[PDB]
């Protein structure tokens, strides 16, 4: 809405500037504006969208955890609960915004495996963030929505992408985190991380130096989690 009067190219340019200035709220607003122009996003533009919202929700999640921890230790007036609720509502708002962009209409216009997997991974992640704070009647549905998005992404990535593809690797990492932290399925988490790592290792020989760097970075993050989990 507010970005309706600005050129798409200007919104992208300003998103990049906002990133350099570490103004992630601005960056997210610019990229929301760019998405709402209705055109598909390039690879670089998808990354800008992801970076922007990851930083915004990242800060909110960190704040929520601080407040939640204080709240649990307190169990004094209603202020901690009230403020935790405030941050929670704001977080849910951002997640809903991202999910809204994915549903209107990024996913349905995403035909290439790379774009579709990227957006479905995002969908899984933002349902996962909703799941982290969920308690009510729709908690199980939120979890299943995350699961469903991740699963579709996994199915496509396995068919259409090499096992070293960074998006495929990052998807597997985050889906494994979903299993461990949300779905109470640590064995599934470990299995997924292990198989992902091993299948990537076997395909490294096909890669250039630059691609090798990117793939091995994410492989190390998988290994880091396996080390923590075992």
């Amino acid at each position: 809405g507010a970005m309706g009067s600005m050129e798409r190219a200007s919104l992208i340019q300003k998103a990049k500037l906002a990133e350099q200035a570490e103004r992630y709220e601005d960056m997210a607003a610019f990229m929301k504006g760019a998405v709402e122009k209705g055109e598909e996003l390039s690879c670089e533009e998808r990354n800008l969208l992801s970076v922007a919202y990851k930083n915004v929700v990242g800060g909110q999640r960190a704040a929520w955890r601080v407040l939640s921890s204080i709240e649990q230790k307190s169990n004094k007036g209603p202020e901690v609960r009230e403020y935790r609720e405030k941050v929670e509502t704001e977080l849910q708002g951002v997640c809903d915004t991202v999910l809204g962009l994915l549903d209107s209409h990024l996913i349905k216009e995403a035909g290439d495996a790379e774009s579709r997997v990227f957006y479905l991974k995002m969908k899984g992640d933002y349902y996962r963030y909703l799941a982290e704070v969920a308690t009510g009647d729709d908690k199980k549905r939120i979890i299943d929505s995350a699961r469903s998005a991740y699963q579709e992404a996994m199915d496509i990535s396995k068919k259409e992408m090499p096992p070293t593809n960074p998006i495929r690797l990052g998807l597997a990492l985050n889906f494994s985190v979903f299993h461990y932290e949300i779905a109470n399925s640590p064995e599934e988490a470990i299995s997924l991380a292990k198989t992902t790592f091993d299948e990537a290792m076997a395909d490294l020989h096909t890669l250039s130096e630059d691609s090798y760097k990117d793939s091995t970075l994410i492989m190390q993050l998988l290994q880091d989690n396996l080390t923590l989990w075992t």
Binding site: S50, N55, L173, N174, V177, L221, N225
Partner: peptide
């Protein structure tokens, strides 16, 4: 918690 994917 466990680390998920960071920014690139």
């Amino acid at each position: 918690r466990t680390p998920s994917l960071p920014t690139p």
